[PDB]
Amino acid sequence: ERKRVSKLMAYILRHSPEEFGLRPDVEGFVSLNELVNALKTVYPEVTEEFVREIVENDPKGRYEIRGDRIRARYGHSFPVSLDHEEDTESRFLYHGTPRRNLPSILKEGLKPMKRQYVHVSTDKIEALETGRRHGREVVLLVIDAECLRKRGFKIYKAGKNVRIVERVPPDCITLAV
């Protein structure tokens, strides 16, 4: 039940709020009341406290509540003005992806694709688990974070391990494992 409701929250908060009549503010927030009411049209037993539980217990840091408003911290496919802190300390960052994507990435770098930002991770396991969602022969990309910063692509702390960055040029990918 938690996972099914969380997946619908991510759909609403990252991709298609307008399908439920919701319009996030410029920071990506909708009111908690609005979200609960939207979830109840699919899952009527859902309550504000069950959503609050999902947010508190989420292992990746998917969601953020500020008072009576809630957003997804990352993953959006519509423009959002996020106020996340910059990651200045990480030396290496990681991105897992199916091997089938590697030829394009070596030419183009990582691109945000359908999302606003490229997503990477401080954590090798999480990076690989993310890649495995997409396919079977996952490669672990090692990314030189200082290479990104030097080129004006600041990295932001979007989640426990999740990091977002405008893009990753291929010169900043040091290894594919």
The DSSP 8-state label assigned to residue 18 in this structure reads G
| SS3 of 72-133 | ECCCCCCCCCCCCCECCCCCEEEEEEEHHHHHHHHHHCECCCCCCCEEEECCHHHHHHHHHH
Cα 8 to Cα 65: distance, rounded to the nearest angstrom: 17
Are 101 and 151 spatial neighbours (Cβ–Cβ below 8 Å)?
Answer: no
Place of tokens 């709020």: 17
Are 118 and 64 spatial neighbours (Cβ–Cβ below 8 Å)?
Answer: no
Cα 65 to Cα 56: distance, rounded to the nearest angstrom: 9
Q: Phi and psi (nearest 5°) for 89?
A: -95, -25
| Domains defined along the chain, listed by start | 2-72 (1.10.10.970), 92-176 (3.20.170.30)
